[PDB]
């Protein structure tokens, strides 16, 4: 308004100058950032000192002037000063004041209508508070603690994201008008943005603060700390009040934040799909990628794509590793040999060949590494630090707390180093059948011995006996381990050291881009294997909740419900741009051409034949009522259209619309066959399966341009087309062109025509056509 005119006058006055003009004309807009630094640069050494030296003055604070006049803030209220007319040297538009002014505002100043929005701004800390209040403390005890150091997360957070996915989110919620082009993360996560926008919209707020708080709401604070007991973010946030080196405040904190359940579910799904793809013999790679992209799962309220969560988590498991490798996702330098965990500290080496005779004379190649290396190892409640040297376990130290875990870790370590005579002459018990190739897929003798150990405890005892046994020398009695795993004995194993106190887990902020083979074995720029499919449990049955396996092989439904779902999918795919589609017809109010679509003609056979006419009447009625006015709900037409193919008739409509398989849908209420919500208006749930509706048109519910972006696209720039806003963008015609402003310092030309395909297929195919 008048303010706008004032801004224009100021811009004019400023352009009248020469230097300001040169700087606002030369270069791009990014220069602003630079200019933001050359100004207001001043620091101090000991702010505490200067704070006591300033607050000892009369007017140590600055403040706005017009805000005080408008607020009717007086001066010398009760013989105590609050401010005096002056001009700070830097701002030139602020006036000195005193701290008393801050109380005078707090006690008899202007009051806002409501302020509960704060609870949303700082949701993380109110969550901290609530989690604290729901704890049941317990007694206090004194003792020594085995605090192990390690990298963990201290802030419980749902839907952990990256930084590039946030710099955009901070715009579509707060400063939308200057929003950039729509990124994929937005089009995919629409309901999330809508939720974050419903709260911080049409509100008086400082937006920078909100953006900072959102960054904190989506940042898991990772720290390298000493830790004891279970590992959960709910505890690490207050670890300071649970136990130290000499004391422990017992308290139960198990039933809060429901975090690890999501991770175990994710890992179970990963295991399932990995096994599925392993069932194949020549395309397990593409099979696995398809199973991935053809799957989704729910998180709290929203539905997220699997491949999106996998690239955000940090669970170092032999399952997640494979998936993150298929999707080209980089990861850390962490190994995995069965259930145990490993990490290399130093050393090097290279593969080498050797053979062993299984029974009598049966040569079988097995490899090892020819050099010295040092490794940290972590099994359940047990740690170890060992070294391998030319097919031998040089030394090892342990700091666990259990005998069984301490024996299993030792055995798996011995195996990992190919130490012992068994690798030189295997036992009679093993045979060529147990060797490898369940159905053709070979198995190195390593995992063979692994399962041979997991089979019987006596195999483990014999393997341990393979390690040298001697008499416990004096003094070393405490640092010794028997065969049962006892801290001391009269005779103990060879080259072993024990101690109380776990080992400090190493750390490295490194990343590597690895690959894998057709047999599901990952490699890292070397002959070393980081993961495989033999290191996971054999198999297990689970009933996954709030998941979507939209893939034929990964499906249990019959041809009937599957046909219904595919018909709905096909009917939705016609929701794009271009004539002959439902949006253009609605705009033209051609409610009749919908009845003659081919998709309804393909779904008609599924309709109950004895009452198809009556239902048809009702459907057509509803459609006209919604279409004639313009107040329609896109989630109801897509439901009732399949019935409008036949001719109306007469009869009593009970209230339900049945198919030929005794499954119905009701027009207005959600059921198992067709459900949806105003929260997430971009999803359709049929028989549990989820379907993503494109965003081409927006009904009464959808209330922004976000619902139109999948209908627009970029095209060659045309200066003839008009320039418009982001709100009038809905009044364009399908197939038209229009210029527009995007983000900042950028203008482009858009066209309301969509592109069905994505790059995943157009590159891979053309590539495979080159290896011939």
């Amino acid at each position: 308004m008048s303010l706008l005119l004032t801004i224009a006058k100021e811009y004019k006055r400023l352009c009248q100058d020469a230097k300001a003009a040169q700087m606002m004309t030369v270069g791009t807009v990014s220069n602003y950032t630079t200019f933001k630094k050359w100004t207001t640069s001043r620091k101090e050494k000991n702010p505490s000192l200067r704070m006591r030296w300033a607050m000892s003055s009369k007017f140590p604070i600055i403040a706005n002037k017009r805000m005080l006049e408008e607020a009717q803030i007086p001066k010398e209220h009760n013989n105590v000063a609050l401010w005096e007319d002056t001009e700070d040297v830097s701002k030139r538009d602020h006036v000195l004041a005193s701290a008393s002014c801050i109380n005078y505002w707090n006690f008899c100043g202007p009051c806002v209508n409501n302020s509960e929005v704060i609870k949303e701004v700082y949701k993380s800390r109110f969550g901290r508070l609530e989690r604290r209040k729901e704890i049941m403390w317990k007694e206090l005890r004194f003792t020594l603690v085995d605090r192990q150091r390690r990298r963990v997360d201290t802030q419980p957070v749902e839907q952990r994201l990256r930084t590039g996915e946030i710099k955009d989110l901070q715009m579509w919620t707060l400063f939308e008008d200057e929003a950039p082009l729509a990124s994929k993360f937005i089009l995919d996560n629409y309901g999330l943005v809508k939720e974050m926008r419903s709260k911080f919209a049409n509100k008086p707020l400082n937006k920078e603060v909100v953006a900072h708080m959102l960054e904190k709401q989506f940042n898991p604070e990772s720290r390298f700390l000493p830790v004891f007991g279970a590992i959960r973010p709910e505890r690490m946030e207050l670890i300071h009040a649970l136990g130290g080196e000499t004391w422990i405040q017992e308290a139960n904190t198990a039933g809060i934040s429901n975090v690890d359940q999501r991770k175990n579910d994710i890992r179970a799904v990963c295991r399932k799909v990995c096994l599925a793809a392993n069932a194949s013999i020549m395309n397990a790679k593409s099979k696995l990628v398809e199973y991935i992209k053809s799957t989704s799962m729910r998180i709290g309220e929203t539905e997220r794509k699997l491949e999106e969560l996998i690239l955000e988590t940090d669970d170092v498991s032999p399952e997640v590793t494979l998936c993150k490798s298929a999707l080209g996702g980089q990861l850390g330098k962490t190994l995995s040999f069965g259930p145990m965990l490993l990490k290399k500290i130093s050393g090097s080496g290279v593969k080498v060949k050797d053979t062993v005779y299984i029974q009598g004379v049966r040569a079988v190649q097995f490899e090892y590494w020819s050099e010295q290396e040092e490794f940290y190892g972590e099994y359940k409640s047990a740690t170890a630090l060992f070294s391998r040297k030319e097919r031998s376990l040089e030394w090892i130290t342990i700091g666990g707390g259990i005998n069984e875990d301490r024996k299993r870790l030792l055995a798996m370590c011995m195996i990992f180093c190919r130490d012992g005579d068994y690798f030189k002459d295997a036992p009679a018990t093993i045979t060529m059948a147990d060797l490898s190739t369940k159905l053709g897929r070979e198995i190195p003798y390593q995992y063979v011995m692994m399962n041979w150990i997991q089979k019987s405890e006596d195999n483990l005892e014999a393997l341990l006996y393979s390690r040298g046994i001697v008499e416990t020398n004096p003094g070393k009695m405490g640092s010794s381990m028997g065969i049962d795993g006892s801290k001391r004995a009269i005779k103990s194993l060879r080259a072993v050291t024990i101690q109380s106190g776990k080992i400090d887990m190493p750390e490295s902020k490194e990343k590597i881009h690895l690959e894998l083979s057709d047999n599901l074995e990952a490699f890292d720029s070397s002959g070393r294997i980081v993961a495989t499919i033999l290191d996971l449990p054999s198999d297990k049955k689970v009933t996954f909740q709030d998941v979507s396996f939209q893939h034929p092989d990964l499906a249990v439904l019959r041809d009937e419900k599957t046909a219904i779902t595919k018909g709905y999918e096909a009917l939705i795919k016609r929701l794009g741009t271009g004539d002959n589609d439902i949006p253009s017809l609605i705009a033209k109010k051609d409610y009749l051409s919908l009845y003659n679509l081919p998709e309804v003609k393909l779904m008609a056979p599924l309709i109950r034949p004895n009452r198809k006419g009556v239902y048809s009447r009702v459907a057509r009625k509803l459609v006209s009522t919604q279409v004639t006015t313009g107040h329609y709900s896109l989630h109801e037409l897509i439901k009732v259209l399949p019935f409008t193919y036949f001719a109306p008739k007469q009869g009593m409509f009970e209230g339900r619309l049945f198919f030929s398989n005794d499954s119905f849908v009701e027009p207005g209420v959600n059921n198992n066959v067709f459900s949806w919500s105003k929260a997430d208006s971009s999803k359709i749930y049929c028989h549990g399966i989820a379907i993503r509706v494109p965003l081409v048109v927006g009904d009464e519910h959808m209330d922004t341009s976000l619902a139109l972006l999948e209908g627009f696209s970029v095209c060659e720039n045309d200066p003839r087309a008009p320039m418009v806003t982001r709100q009038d963008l809905i009044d364009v015609g399908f197939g038209q062109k229009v210029r527009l402003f995007v983000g900042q310092g950028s203008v482009r030309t858009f066209k309301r025509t969509a592109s069905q395909r994505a790059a995943s297929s157009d590159v891979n195919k053309n590539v495979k056509k080159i290896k011939m």
Partner: protein, 158 residues
Amino acid sequence: MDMKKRIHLELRNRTPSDVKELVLDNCRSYEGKIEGLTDEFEELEFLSTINVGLASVANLPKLNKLKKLELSDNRVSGGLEVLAEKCPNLTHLNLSGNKIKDLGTIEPLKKLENLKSLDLFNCEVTNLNDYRENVFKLLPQLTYLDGYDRDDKEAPDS
């Protein structure tokens, strides 16, 4: 969206003086306060405001030719005397889904002598004893209540 944009959209270049109907369902109004309404709307005879986070009726201007209103799904409570001040020619009213506790809040509606039908469903008042009868004794001119007249006479379609 916002009642302002919704209205400006519904007004496809049409003056706000020749319309006979309007709808604003599935919208939002800041502070639960009307925004964009004026006395310019004279020929309007129907209105529909549903699920718009409404809580009161204070900015509602004077509409005489109006003879039907809908305020369901909101949380209005207490303000029911303006109707006499702004819409004294009203006949059909609906409030199902709003915050209504006692009958004293309903008493003003007696002055709407042109009132015929009222709709109260899912409100607390309905959970009292002898409420239909007491209401009828309060509002005698009324005939239909939630679609049913005395003796449970189902009302026709329209």
